[PDB]
Paper text:
We selected the ICH system because it diffracts x-rays to atomic resolution at ambient temperature, has clearly visible diffuse features in ambient temperature x-ray diffraction datasets, and displays large concerted motion of an α-helix that is modulated by the chemical state of the active site nucleophile.
Engineered mutations at residue 150 (e.g., G150A, G150T) also favor shifted conformations of the helix to varying degrees. The refined WT and G150A ICH models are also highly similar (∼0.05–0.07 Å Cα RMSD). We find that the CCCross is ≥0.83 for every WT and G150A dataset, and each data pair within the set of replicate WT and G150A datasets also has CC ≥ 0.8, as shown in orange-colored cells in Table S5. The high cross correlation between WT and G150A diffuse datasets provides additional evidence that protein-derived diffuse scattering is the dominant feature in the processed diffuse anisotropic maps and is consistent with the minor differences in the crystal structures refined against the Bragg data. In general, the CCLLM values are higher and σ values are lower for the Refmac5 anisotropic ADP models compared to those refined in PHENIX.
Residue numbers in the entry:
A (entry chain B): -1 to 227
B (entry chain A): 1 to 227
């Protein structure tokens, strides 16, 4: 309808698609929501896995949003130094009811200046990069600070989106969606956190991330310097 | 030598049934993931999210794994002889025949649940028995080379189970850690067993028209298998 809650996801090249598609299916289950997939122009955008998604609107044509949500992925490093994307995020965040992210999407909120003095989370492997962007780093899976909600790594988007659903509507509505999703997880292993995974698995995870972390640290301090100037 | 994994992408799919497993399995070494429909190109999910089929039935390579997602669109597939024939063709040689949520009703309409333990979404579980399944109230059910997941988000638990079968436990654990899959749901309403009675009543009330229409489709599909 014309009175729909307006929810926008930034959709960028080399996005981690589950960061977007998990929350999308949760939030699209709510009454009279319109969901936008936003990029520089409408059309196909390829996720890091090769899954092809479709942007529905440009930055220019995007209506004022009630909720803005930034997913993460390999493509965040480019977004953290994209003045056009950062200007769009700051413009929308000025009037949004909620300003939100999943996974390394919070590093883009950081680069836009929106984490200064705010509680935030991100993916466990990149959590050290929050503090240089002025955030108070919190090791919790969904973190609220006023109208800022951030989720931790990839699959945290589902917990994040049910939290946001309760704020937009109420606990009863969020619970109904949880039940419709049959979201009673029973993971076959206990390796979802660096605290519970076998030590061998964490060390491998840390080493495989090392070159990405060193590259993102340099981008992060360039982005921090632009907030300082 | 690459493991060939195929998802059936159909109009009015519940996209998370496909996209959850896709991001888990596409994270594995030496896999190639296909999104299959009658022709390549755009296929719109029940939410309005646009996905893109990568291959026609004809161009689909022999699959190691076939996976049928669920959604509003399964009712049409349960009486689509081309889709059912395609699923039987791939199931014949596939190492694993699989589904998530109401995708198991499509496996049932194809004749592939006869005498097998299976699950589906809690609200549609009564439809498994008429399609010949032994209905099991577990979130991921394995019977030989058949794996079925329960409702929508069960696809993530299903896909990690499958990852360990294709590779090993250590490989599945690495992907679980990369996905930070240590769930902390903000409510305890994911099962009819644990949700408040008011929430169950409302979820059953919303599903009622869909369930009645699927009762009718199911009994026509079962009558075809019998004849």
């Amino acid at each position: 309808s014309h009175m729909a809650v307006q929810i926008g996801f930034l959709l960028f090249p080399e996005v981690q698609q589950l960061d977007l598609t998990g929350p999308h299916d949760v939030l699209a289950s709510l009454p009279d929501v319109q969901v936008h997939l936003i990029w520089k122009e409408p059309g196909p955008v390829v996720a890091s896995s090769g899954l092809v998604l479709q942007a529905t609107t440009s930055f220019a044509d995007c209506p004022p949003l009630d909720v803005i949500c930034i997913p993460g992925g390999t493509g965040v490093g480019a977004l953290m130094e994209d003045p056009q994307a950062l200007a769009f995020i700051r413009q929308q965040a000025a009037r949004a009811r909620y300003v939100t992210s999943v996974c390394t999407g919070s590093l883009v909120l950081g680069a836009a200046g929106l984490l200064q003095g705010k509680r935030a989370t991100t993916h466990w492997a990149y959590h050290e990069l929050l503090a240089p962007l002025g955030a108070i780093p919190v090791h919790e899976r969904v973190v609220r600070d006023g109208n800022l909600l951030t989720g931790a790594g990839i699959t945290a988007g589902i917990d994040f989106a049910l939290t946001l659903a309760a704020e937009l509507f109420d606990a009863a509505t969020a619970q109904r969606v949880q039940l419709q999703l049959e979201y009673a997880p029973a993971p076959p292993f206990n390796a979802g956190s660096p605290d519970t995974a076998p030590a061998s698995v964490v060390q491998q995870a840390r080493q495989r991330a090392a070159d990405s972390l060193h590259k993102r640290r340099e981008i992060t301090l360039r982005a921090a310097a632009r907030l300082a100037a």
